Amino acid sequence: HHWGYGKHNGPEHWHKDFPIAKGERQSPVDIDTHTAKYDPSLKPLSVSYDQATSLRILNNGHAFNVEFDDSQDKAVLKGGPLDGTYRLIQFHFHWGSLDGQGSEHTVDKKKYAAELHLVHWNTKYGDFGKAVQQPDGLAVLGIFLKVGSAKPGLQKVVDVLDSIKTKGKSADFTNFDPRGLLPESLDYWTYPGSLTTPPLLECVTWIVLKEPISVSSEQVLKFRKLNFNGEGEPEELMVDNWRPAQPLKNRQIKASFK
Ligand SMILES: NS(=O)(=O)c1cc(C(=O)O)c(Cl)cc1Cl
Numbered sequence: 005h006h007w008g009y010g011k012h013n014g015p016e017h018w019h020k021d022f023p024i025a026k027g028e029r030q031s032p033v034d035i036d037t038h039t040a041k042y043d044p045s046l047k048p049l050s051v052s053y054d055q056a057t058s059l060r061i062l063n064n065g066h067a068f069n070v071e072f073d074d075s076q077d078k079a080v081l082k083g084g085p086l087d088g089t090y091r092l093i094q095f096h097f098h099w100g101s102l103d104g105q106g107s108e109h110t111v112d113k114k115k116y117a118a119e120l121h122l123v124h125w126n127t128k129y130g131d132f133g134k135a136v137q138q139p140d141g142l143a144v145l146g147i148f149l150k151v152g153s154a155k156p157g158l159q160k161v162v163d164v165l166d167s168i169k170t171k172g173k174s175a176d177f178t179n180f181d182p183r184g185l186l187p188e189s190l191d192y193w194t195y196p197g198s199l200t201t202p203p204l205l206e207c208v209t210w211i212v213l214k215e216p217i218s219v220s221s222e223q224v225l226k227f228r229k230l231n232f233n234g235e236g237e238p239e240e241l242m243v244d245n246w247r248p249a250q251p252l253k254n255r256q257i258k259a260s261f262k
């Protein structure tokens with residue numbers, strides 16, 4: 005009886021196995037745009053993905069991860085609120101059963117259809133597993149998805165999903181360029197938070213871009229054909245794999261922009 009996104013094992017249950025679920029810096033949160041404070045001391049983000057080396061795509065039973073070679077500084081995030089260099093390890097999405105839900109963060113209570121998370125770890129800690137034990141161990145770049153025009157740079161992802169329909173399946177996924185998933189603007193909000201999936205560790209500097217990307221209805225429909233279940237098990241569509249907004253508590257959300 006493992007955690008998931010159902011009635012009997014979903015986010016309201018996670019605290020029993022992971023009591024940090026009720027902690028002081030949990031994610032996601034609602035971003036109240038009027039009370040976020042512009043911080044003129046924040047820097048432009050530096051997103052340096054030209055040398056990224058994607059390797060594989062995996063259905064892990066909760067989402068799918070596009071995995072990168074993080075054994076050198078190839079794809080790194082720096083600047084903004086961050087001190088030092090954070091290496092891209094994977095990206096994944098959260099999405100809904102319907103276009104009106106799916107994002108983890110919300111903006112003035114608005115839910116987007118989906119949310120992309122590019123996960124990076126602080127190189128000063130040597131490996132991901134050590135980084136997640138530190139309050140500044142990870143930086144996640146979060147990007148909202150709305151349904152409208154297709155995102156050309158997403159289509160290669162979409163088209164491999166039939167090969168990883170069920171939990172535990174992977175496929176080679178080399179030469180994918182994550183620059184094709186970014187919006188035009190790097191304006192962002194930032195706050196200290198957590199993993200949004202168990203173990204919910206409080207190790208993340210969240211950087212949530214203001215500008216959503218647009219994806220087509222057909223693209224998101226293909227996300228919704230994935231399965232939470234393994235092969236040869238009754239079908240459970242992989243939809244609504246998002247944690248809702250958590251209490252902000254003693255945190256301030258900062259804006260990079262006026
Ligand atoms: N949703 S999230 O907080 O970006 C997040 C998710 C996962 C996961 O694969 O479930 C991992 Cl390992 C790290 C992070 Cl930081």
Ligand SMILES: [Zn+2]
Pocket residue numbers: 096097098121200
């Ligand atoms: Zn995520």
